[PDB]
Design a protein around this ligand. Structure first.
Ligand SMILES: [Cl-]
Ligand SMILES: [Cl-]
Length: 162
């Protein structure tokens, strides 16, 4: 199991514009297009991202290309973040993937905001961090996903995904 397979389970794959859990226009493997309520704005953002007149539909290959870009961007975003990087550097391979999953979903800023949990993770106090992670809007809104990510941090294995 690896980050890609992990996020592919968490996000799914849709080849036509759809709205995410928050009602935002998305496509592919969790690729957010816009927070704007307008479908045209989404379609415009889509064409600009793909480089062709898509008319709101993309192919598998195209979805996979945005996904590679988005995963690469999340990692580079963590490594650029003065708050995230040291956490990231202190973790093992599996837990690093859990942190990348969070950033992919809620952005760097978003995650950098879990101050207390981050400190706990940095300190390798797994159970405590898991508990702290759970008191969040994130957990309350998307609990099944949150729970898989939390178990991954708590245990250091991919069991939640097998
Ligand atoms: Cl893009
Ligand atoms: Cl969920």
């Amino acid at each position: 199991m690896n980050i890609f397979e992990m996020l592919r389970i968490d996000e799914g794959l849709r080849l036509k514009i759809y709205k995410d859990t928050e009602g935002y226009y998305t496509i592919g493997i969790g690729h957010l297009l816009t927070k704007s309520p307008s479908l045209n704005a989404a379609k415009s953002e889509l064409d600009k991202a793909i480089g062709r007149n898509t008319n709101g539909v993309i192919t598998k290959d195209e979805a996979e290309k945005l996904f590679n870009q988005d995963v690469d961007a999340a990692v580079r975003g963590i490594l650029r973040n003065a708050k995230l990087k040291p956490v990231y550097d202190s973790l093992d391979a599996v837990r690093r993937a859990a942190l990348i999953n969070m950033v992919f979903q809620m952005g760097e800023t978003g995650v950098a905001g879990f101050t207390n949990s981050l400190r706990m993770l940095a300190q390798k106090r797994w159970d405590e961090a898991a508990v702290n992670l759970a008191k969040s809007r994130w957990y309350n809104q998307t609990p099944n996903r949150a729970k898989r990510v939390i178990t991954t941090f708590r245990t250091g294995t991919w069991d939640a995904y097998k």
